[PDB]
Ligand binder design. Structure first.
Ligand code: 1TF
Length: 537
């Protein structure tokens, strides 16, 4: 029923079984380990709940402001245990205090090392020998916090276990262990790192994303520990590992026991997936272990994924018609490549015209709408924004299609042969002469000339959008730069039929990224308009 009730059931069945293991690469370059059994985590969870009962009541919000690590886990788990609506955030910012005022928490859960009462859970006697809600568990973040219920989580996990383990009858192997470096304050990292261990019943090997960025090879190492690994990562993280990994760190590594590596949170590029398998197949990586996965925070986390026992399937479509709005399949190798996503059984996906609230015919591109019990009930204390995002109603629905409520994802997609495809985020698209061009395709054209980071943004000017590209380039003459500017400009002209209004050659690190690495094409637009970039001239 509730995460607290399942944790308590993990303690009954397997008191001394390992639950959470955190590898800390901060002091030692090769990492220091520490593990808790189900008994130890429950005990810390109970102790955090006691200190929280002293400051807040059932229904109050508890903001979690801690670095990655075991203390984050018992802070989050201690909140739900005391019947508080947890609020996972990142440790220090103005957009952190925007949440705090939107959520109005009655307690803050912090660490020594970093009006409402604040608790330092590290300084609490967490190993000292010795209620929950049943609807709203936590908010996932004008800032808008998604309301996630235990019914939301459980339903999504049931949809997940069924799709991810369809070839083994929705039963994961006895060997399974979760491995994640994803941050706990993000959709994927929190459900995979903190919740899945308890709901699934396996242990977790966890670390920080700054440790992965330092040395992306630790990801492969930790996955290859005893058992079958279940992990996840954004697309570019697959790139970063295929690039900056040394066969010396991978000395005598077995990757054949890996069970699932999810690729999600951003567009999945076939080019990136081929590099990953072509490079780590040497160490026995099974390619059907790579599972494209689509989702939103508004759906708890999961919407669709690739078939269980097969490697990712790739489809090909004519690029010219794609911009026109039409998906016309073409021969293998020709046109744009897109990862096929089988239309999910649960939740269900439909492609809808955002202007007429009516479904699109197959091959026609519209907005992705989602329906299912994993879809959240709305945004915390935001009635109007909840109506816009969650109040989707289908006009004259097709046979077998509910009329509502539908979650409007803001993503472009289409169906082709009972498979559906994700083009990209609508507001991030570039419209030029009625055609739609996606930044993921543009940057893929640049990212293969420069092999650095990019961002293809749309700057409005006197009634039209103009293509601007921020191109990170290595800093270590005034020619050579011309060869690159001229190279990329022509590569965008011939591959996309677009003119580059401005190419900003910046130093490495200039483009805004996340902690896991998603390029922030949103800020870039105003950093450009406010002339915040320094060019290599
Ligand atoms: C057995 C143990 C249990 C497993 C536990 C693991 C849990 C994680 C599994 C689900 C992974 C699903 C990605 C989560 C998206 C996210 O990270 O959540 P969120 O931050 O809300 O952003 C969402 C927005 O990102 C874009 N996006 C996301 N996936 C995209 C794609 N495959 N292709 C293209 N675009 C894509 C899209 O635009 C969307 O709207």
């Amino acid at each position: 029923l509730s995460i607290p009730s399942m944790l308590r059931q993990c303690v009954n069945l397997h008191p001394d079984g390992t639950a959470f293991t955190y590898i800390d690469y901060e002091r030692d370059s090769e990492g220091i380990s520490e593990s808790l059994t189900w008994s130890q985590v429950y005990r810390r969870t109970l102790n955090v709940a006691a200190e929280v009962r002293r400051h807040a009541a059932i229904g109050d919000r508890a903001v979690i402001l801690a670095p990655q690590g075991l203390d984050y886990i018992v802070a989050f788990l201690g909140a739900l245990q005391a019947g508080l609506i947890a609020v996972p955030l990142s440790a220090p910012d103005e957009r952190v205090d925007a949440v705090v005022r939107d959520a109005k928490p009655n307690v803050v859960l912090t660490t020594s090392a970093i009006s409402p009462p604040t608790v330092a859970v590290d300084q609490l006697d967490l190993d000292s020998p010795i209620d929950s809600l049943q609807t709203t568990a936590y908010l996932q973040y004008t800032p808008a916090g998604v309301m996630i219920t235990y019914k939301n989580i459980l339903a999504n996990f049931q949809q997940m276990i069924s799709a991810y383990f369809a070839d083994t009858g929705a039963v994961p192997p006895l060997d399974l262990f979760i491995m994640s470096w994803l941050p706990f304050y993000h959709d994927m990292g929190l459900v995979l790192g903190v919740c899945a261990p308890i709901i699934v019943g396996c242990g977790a090997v966890l670390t920080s994303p700054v440790a992965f960025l330092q040395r992306p090879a630790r990801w492969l190492q930790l996955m290859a520990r005893e058992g079958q690994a279940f992990s996840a990562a954004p697309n570019f993280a697959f790139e970063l590992t295929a690039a900056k990994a040394i066969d010396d760190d991978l000395a005598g590594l077995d990757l054949g026991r890996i069970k699932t590596i999810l690729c999600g949170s951003e567009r999945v590029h076939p080019a990136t997936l081929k590099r990953f398998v072509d490079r780590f197949s040497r160490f026995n990586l099974r390619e059907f272990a790579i599972r494209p996965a689509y989702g939103l925070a508004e759906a708890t986390v999961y919407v669709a994924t690739s078939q269980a026992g097969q490697p990712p399937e790739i489809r090909y479509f004519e690029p010219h018609e794609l911009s026109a709005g039409q998906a016309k399949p073409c021969a293998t190798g020709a046109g744009t490549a897109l990862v096929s996503y089988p239309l999910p059984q649960s939740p269900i996906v439909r492609i809808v015209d955002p202007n007429t609230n009516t479904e699109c015919p197959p091959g026609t591109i519209g907005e992705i709408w989602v329906h299912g019990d994993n879809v959240a009930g709305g945004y915390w204390e935001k009635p109007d924004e909840t109506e816009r995002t969650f109040g989707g109603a289908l006009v004259a629905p097709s046979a077998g299609t509910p009329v509502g409520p539908w979650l409007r994802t803001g993503d472009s997609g289409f169906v082709s042969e009972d498979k559906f495809f994700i083009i990209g985020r609508i507001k991030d698209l570039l419209i030029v002469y009625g055609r739609n061009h996606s930044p993921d395709d543009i940057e893929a054209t640049i990212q293969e000339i420069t092999r650095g980071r990019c961002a293809a943004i749309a700057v409005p000017s006197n009634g039209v959008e103009k293509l601007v590209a921020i191109v990170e380039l290595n800093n270590r003459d005034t020619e050579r730069l011309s060869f690159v500017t001229r190279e990329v400009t022509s590569a965008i002209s011939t591959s996309h039929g677009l003119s580059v209004s401005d190419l900003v050659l910046v130093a490495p690190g200039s483009i805004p990224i996340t902690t896991s690495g998603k390029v922030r094409r949103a800020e870039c637009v105003k950093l450009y308009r406010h002339n915040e970039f320094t060019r290599l001239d």
